[PDB]
Design an enzyme around this catalytic site. Structure first.
Site, PDB file in Angstrom:
ATOM      1  N   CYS A 172       0.844 -22.981   0.920  1.00  0.00           N
ATOM      2  CA  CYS A 172       1.458 -21.877   1.921  1.00  0.00           C
ATOM      3  C   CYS A 172       2.400 -22.558   2.991  1.00  0.00           C
ATOM      4  O   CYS A 172       1.487 -23.463   3.782  1.00  0.00           O
ATOM      5  CB  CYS A 172       0.225 -21.109   2.630  1.00  0.00           C
ATOM      6  SG  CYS A 172       0.439 -20.143   3.788  1.00  0.00           S
ATOM      7  N   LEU A 173       3.438 -21.948   3.237  1.00  0.00           N
ATOM      8  CA  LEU A 173       4.288 -22.677   4.125  1.00  0.00           C
ATOM      9  C   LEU A 173       3.671 -22.084   5.662  1.00  0.00           C
ATOM     10  O   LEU A 173       4.050 -22.801   6.426  1.00  0.00           O
ATOM     11  CB  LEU A 173       5.524 -21.941   4.069  1.00  0.00           C
ATOM     12  CG  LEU A 173       6.247 -22.756   2.799  1.00  0.00           C
ATOM     13  CD1 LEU A 173       7.536 -21.869   2.188  1.00  0.00           C
ATOM     14  CD2 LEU A 173       6.451 -23.895   3.270  1.00  0.00           C
ATOM     15  N   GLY A 174       3.000 -21.022   5.715  1.00  0.00           N
ATOM     16  CA  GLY A 174       2.580 -20.217   6.947  1.00  0.00           C
ATOM     17  C   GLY A 174       1.185 -20.635   7.260  1.00  0.00           C
ATOM     18  O   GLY A 174       0.681 -20.164   8.323  1.00  0.00           O
ATOM     19  N   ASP A 218      -0.988  -9.339   5.330  1.00  0.00           N
ATOM     20  CA  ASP A 218      -2.187  -8.949   4.728  1.00  0.00           C
ATOM     21  C   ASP A 218      -3.212  -9.940   4.729  1.00  0.00           C
ATOM     22  O   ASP A 218      -4.343  -9.880   5.070  1.00  0.00           O
ATOM     23  CB  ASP A 218      -1.984  -8.091   3.309  1.00  0.00           C
ATOM     24  CG  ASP A 218      -1.179  -6.915   3.531  1.00  0.00           C
ATOM     25  OD1 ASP A 218      -0.732  -6.123   2.359  1.00  0.00           O
ATOM     26  OD2 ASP A 218      -1.202  -6.232   4.460  1.00  0.00           O
ATOM     27  N   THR A 219      -2.528 -11.243   4.571  1.00  0.00           N
ATOM     28  CA  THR A 219      -3.586 -12.415   4.515  1.00  0.00           C
ATOM     29  C   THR A 219      -4.090 -12.531   5.823  1.00  0.00           C
ATOM     30  O   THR A 219      -5.470 -12.414   5.951  1.00  0.00           O
ATOM     31  CB  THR A 219      -2.693 -13.818   4.222  1.00  0.00           C
ATOM     32  OG1 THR A 219      -1.472 -13.668   4.891  1.00  0.00           O
ATOM     33  CG2 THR A 219      -2.129 -13.745   2.422  1.00  0.00           C
ATOM     34  N   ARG A 224       0.761  -1.174   0.180  1.00  0.00           N
ATOM     35  CA  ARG A 224      -0.104  -0.071  -0.003  1.00  0.00           C
ATOM     36  C   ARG A 224       1.023   1.211   0.174  1.00  0.00           C
ATOM     37  O   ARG A 224       0.822   2.005   0.800  1.00  0.00           O
ATOM     38  CB  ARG A 224      -0.929  -0.149   1.038  1.00  0.00           C
ATOM     39  CG  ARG A 224      -2.347  -0.765   0.863  1.00  0.00           C
ATOM     40  CD  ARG A 224      -2.943  -1.396   2.112  1.00  0.00           C
ATOM     41  NE  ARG A 224      -1.977  -2.353   2.471  1.00  0.00           N
ATOM     42  CZ  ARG A 224      -1.472  -2.789   3.840  1.00  0.00           C
ATOM     43  NH1 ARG A 224      -2.035  -2.010   4.930  1.00  0.00           N
ATOM     44  NH2 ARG A 224      -0.506  -3.501   4.194  1.00  0.00           N
TER      45      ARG A 224
HETATM   46  C1  HEM Z   1      -4.790 -16.933   6.431  1.00  0.00           C
HETATM   47  C2  HEM Z   1      -3.778 -16.523   6.100  1.00  0.00           C
HETATM   48  C3  HEM Z   1      -3.225 -17.080   4.824  1.00  0.00           C
HETATM   49  C4  HEM Z   1      -3.891 -17.400   3.509  1.00  0.00           C
HETATM   50  C5  HEM Z   1      -5.085 -17.345   3.128  1.00  0.00           C
HETATM   51  C6  HEM Z   1      -2.559 -17.899   3.001  1.00  0.00           C
HETATM   52  C7  HEM Z   1      -2.413 -18.240   1.285  1.00  0.00           C
HETATM   53  C8  HEM Z   1      -1.538 -18.732   0.676  1.00  0.00           C
HETATM   54  C9  HEM Z   1      -1.620 -19.113  -0.760  1.00  0.00           C
HETATM   55  C10 HEM Z   1      -2.736 -19.247  -1.477  1.00  0.00           C
HETATM   56  C11 HEM Z   1      -0.180 -19.657  -1.339  1.00  0.00           C
HETATM   57  C12 HEM Z   1       0.290 -20.110  -2.529  1.00  0.00           C
HETATM   58  C13 HEM Z   1       0.170 -19.121  -3.743  1.00  0.00           C
HETATM   59  C14 HEM Z   1       0.483 -19.674  -4.895  1.00  0.00           C
HETATM   60  O1  HEM Z   1       0.455 -21.134  -5.045  1.00  0.00           O
HETATM   61  O2  HEM Z   1       1.272 -19.131  -5.724  1.00  0.00           O
HETATM   62  C15 HEM Z   1       0.773 -18.968  -0.041  1.00  0.00           C
HETATM   63  C16 HEM Z   1       2.039 -19.191  -0.248  1.00  0.00           C
HETATM   64  C17 HEM Z   1       3.012 -18.733   0.936  1.00  0.00           C
HETATM   65  N1  HEM Z   1       2.549 -18.231   2.054  1.00  0.00           N
HETATM   66 FE1  HEM Z   1       0.751 -18.106   2.857  1.00  0.00          FE
HETATM   67  N2  HEM Z   1      -1.355 -17.591   3.459  1.00  0.00           N
HETATM   68  C18 HEM Z   1      -1.725 -17.282   4.595  1.00  0.00           C
HETATM   69  C19 HEM Z   1      -0.603 -17.045   5.677  1.00  0.00           C
HETATM   70  C20 HEM Z   1       0.911 -16.961   5.592  1.00  0.00           C
HETATM   71  C21 HEM Z   1       1.526 -16.947   6.818  1.00  0.00           C
HETATM   72  C22 HEM Z   1       1.333 -16.844   8.137  1.00  0.00           C
HETATM   73  C23 HEM Z   1       2.973 -17.169   6.144  1.00  0.00           C
HETATM   74  C24 HEM Z   1       4.298 -16.890   6.642  1.00  0.00           C
HETATM   75  C25 HEM Z   1       4.431 -16.809   8.103  1.00  0.00           C
HETATM   76  C26 HEM Z   1       2.742 -17.252   4.550  1.00  0.00           C
HETATM   77  C27 HEM Z   1       3.892 -17.404   3.895  1.00  0.00           C
HETATM   78  C28 HEM Z   1       3.850 -18.032   2.630  1.00  0.00           C
HETATM   79  C29 HEM Z   1       4.796 -18.029   1.618  1.00  0.00           C
HETATM   80  C30 HEM Z   1       6.294 -17.874   2.220  1.00  0.00           C
HETATM   81  C31 HEM Z   1       4.433 -18.791   0.375  1.00  0.00           C
HETATM   82  C32 HEM Z   1       5.094 -19.106  -0.703  1.00  0.00           C
HETATM   83  C33 HEM Z   1       5.149 -20.703  -0.794  1.00  0.00           C
HETATM   84  C34 HEM Z   1       6.032 -21.403  -2.071  1.00  0.00           C
HETATM   85  O3  HEM Z   1       6.136 -20.439  -2.934  1.00  0.00           O
HETATM   86  O4  HEM Z   1       6.443 -22.479  -2.152  1.00  0.00           O
HETATM   87  N3  HEM Z   1       1.421 -17.126   4.294  1.00  0.00           N
HETATM   88  N4  HEM Z   1       0.089 -18.165   1.009  1.00  0.00           N
HETATM   89  C1  LIG Z   2      -0.240 -13.752  -2.375  1.00  0.00           C
HETATM   90  C2  LIG Z   2       0.766 -13.834  -1.318  1.00  0.00           C
HETATM   91  C3  LIG Z   2       0.515 -12.852  -0.123  1.00  0.00           C
HETATM   92  C4  LIG Z   2       0.766 -15.184  -0.449  1.00  0.00           C
HETATM   93  C5  LIG Z   2       1.765 -15.244   0.464  1.00  0.00           C
HETATM   94  C6  LIG Z   2       2.708 -14.192  -0.412  1.00  0.00           C
HETATM   95  C7  LIG Z   2       2.235 -13.928  -1.656  1.00  0.00           C
HETATM   96  C8  LIG Z   2       2.789 -12.912  -2.443  1.00  0.00           C
HETATM   97  C9  LIG Z   2       2.297 -15.321  -2.352  1.00  0.00           C
HETATM   98  O1  LIG Z   2       2.918 -15.696  -3.255  1.00  0.00           O
HETATM   99  C10 LIG Z   2       1.118 -16.129  -2.126  1.00  0.00           C
END
Ligand code: HEM
Ligand SMILES: CC1(C)[C@@H]2CC[C@@]1(C)C(=O)C2
Length: 391
Positions: free
Chosen positions: A332-334, A226-227, A161
């Site tokens: 998602c790792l998180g 933001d998620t 933002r």
């Molecule tokens: C409700 C909260 C969250 C939702 C709905 C969510 C959603 C996702 C989704 C859908 C992806 C995969 C995107 C793709 O396939 O291109 C993802 C990837 C990832 N997310 Fe989460 N996320 C959440 C919370 C988190 C948290 C807490 C962290 C870290 C502490 C996280 C870090 C990541 C990272 C590092 C990736 C990339 C994984 C990869 O590329 O191999 N996000 N997020």
């Molecule tokens: C859309 C996201 C916020 C989610 C975690 C980081 C992000 C940029 C991704 O690649 C998946």
């Protein structure tokens, strides 16, 4: 705003949906997207908005495409424009075992946030609770001082933002400028925090380079912001509008993890995509090399072909199904940390502020994008009906 229809797109497939500004935004962002899931809309459509891109509207297609990484590349996942090894490392730092250990501190964090609000009888939950929570969690997770939050939250706020003081590159660079010295300092060391563990991590049989560490550290910071902020907000919006569900969880706090999961389906928010690495016919549609395809994580759980009465929220829902956290090799790792923050927030909120509701006369606004969200969430409640609980 409409890009010229490429030679290979048939006209019966054209549904011009603006993922940055859908038509039915005022009905709620999920509702606005679920227009793609109406009886008369094909499973796979083309929109001329945002440069022109595909959209998979159904769970089957979305899942299949994220499995088919050879055809559908993550080189350009954003509209418009040994991995396993890096994931294993990241999972060391945010996996279930780390989440399990931190729960205690996540709960303390949540409790002083709610406590500092509780007596007010009102707050903007999005700004007052939801924003300051996941950034503080990352500091905890990464052995970082609270004093670093204002500068750090500023940088991450600029990436998504911008106020215009910093270009994305500048903000990216400053984040790295901040991280590098900590990484190099903790690389020398047996720190048990997340930067230490990433710092000292091995990849491809050699150690991780500094550039690689700052990069993973960067996505761990920004992906969990933001998620979570927005998801918490949708969830609290719902509970504010629905006393029956609020009492259901008050009366049966052990139901909370299943509610979380049901809310993750119902209030899914991410819409990522991929780029075609070559021509490819997919579910009877000619995709062309270079085409970008939106594969809305949001849509899977809202598809009636996957859940009956998709728009209805039921905590007893028997087979909850969704790709809210993605699917395939980038899942998602998180997600584990996210679930914990969700569950902890709801329990710790509800046991302190059982009765609450949307400020009278206020109308909640949603926004729509890669990560959809909530502009603001004003709540009110009578302090007399709250309570204090200390740890
Ligand atoms: C409700 C909260 C969250 C939702 C709905 C969510 C959603 C996702 C989704 C859908 C992806 C995969 C995107 C793709 O396939 O291109 C993802 C990837 C990832 N997310 Fe989460 N996320 C959440 C919370 C988190 C948290 C807490 C962290 C870290 C502490 C996280 C870090 C990541 C990272 C590092 C990736 C990339 C994984 C990869 O590329 O191999 N996000 N997020
Ligand atoms: C859309 C996201 C916020 C989610 C975690 C980081 C992000 C940029 C991704 O690649 C998946």
């Amino acid at each position: 705003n409409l890009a010229p229809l490429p030679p290979h797109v048939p006209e019966h497939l054209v549904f011009d949906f603006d993922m940055y500004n859908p038509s039915n935004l005022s009905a709620g962002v999920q509702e606005a997207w679920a227009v793609l899931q109406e009886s008369n809309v094909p499973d796979l459509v083309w929109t001329r908005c945002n440069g022109g891109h595909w959209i998979a509207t159904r769970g089957q297609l979305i899942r299949e495409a994220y499995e088919d990484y050879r055809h559908f590349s993550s080189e350009c996942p954003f509209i418009p424009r040994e991995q396993r090894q890096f994931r294993a490392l990241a999972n060391q730092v945010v996996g279930m075992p780390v989440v399990d250990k931190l729960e205690n501190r996540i709960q303390e964090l949540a409790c002083s946030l709610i406590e500092s609000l509780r007596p007010q009888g009102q707050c903007n939950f999005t700004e007052d609770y939801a924003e300051p929570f996941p950034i503080r969690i990352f500091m905890l997770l990464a052995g970082l001082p609270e004093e670093d939050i204002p500068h750090l939250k500023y940088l991450t706020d600029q990436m998504t933002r911008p106020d215009g003081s910093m270009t994305f590159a500048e903000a990216k660079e400053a984040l790295y400028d901040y991280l590098i010295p900590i990484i190099e300092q903790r690389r020398q060391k047996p720190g048990t925090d997340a930067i230490s563990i990433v710092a000292n991590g091995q990849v491809n049989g050699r150690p991780i380079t500094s550039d690689e560490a700052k990069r993973m550290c960067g996505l761990l910071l920004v992906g969990g912001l933001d998620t979570v902020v927005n998801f918490l907000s949708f969830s609290m919006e719902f509970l504010a509008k629905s006393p029956e569900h609020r009492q259901e969880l008050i009366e049966r706090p052990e139901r909370i993890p299943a509610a979380c999961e049901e809310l993750l389906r119902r209030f899914s928010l991410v819409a990522d995509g991929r780029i075609l690495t070559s021509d490819y016919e997919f579910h009877g549609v000619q995709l062309k090399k270079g085409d970008q395809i939106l594969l809305p994580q949001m849509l899977s759980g809202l598809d009636e072909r996957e859940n009956a009465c998709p728009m209805h929220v039921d905590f007893s829902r028997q087979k909850v199904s969704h790709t809210t956290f993605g699917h395939g090799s980038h899942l998602c790792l998180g997600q584990h940390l996210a679930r914990r923050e969700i569950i902890v927030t709801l329990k710790e909120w509800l046991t302190r502020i059982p009765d609450f509701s949307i400020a009278p006369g206020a109308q909640i606004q949603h926004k729509s994008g890669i990560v959809s969200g909530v502009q603001a969430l004003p709540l009110v409640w009578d302090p007399a009906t709250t309570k204090a609980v200390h740890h």
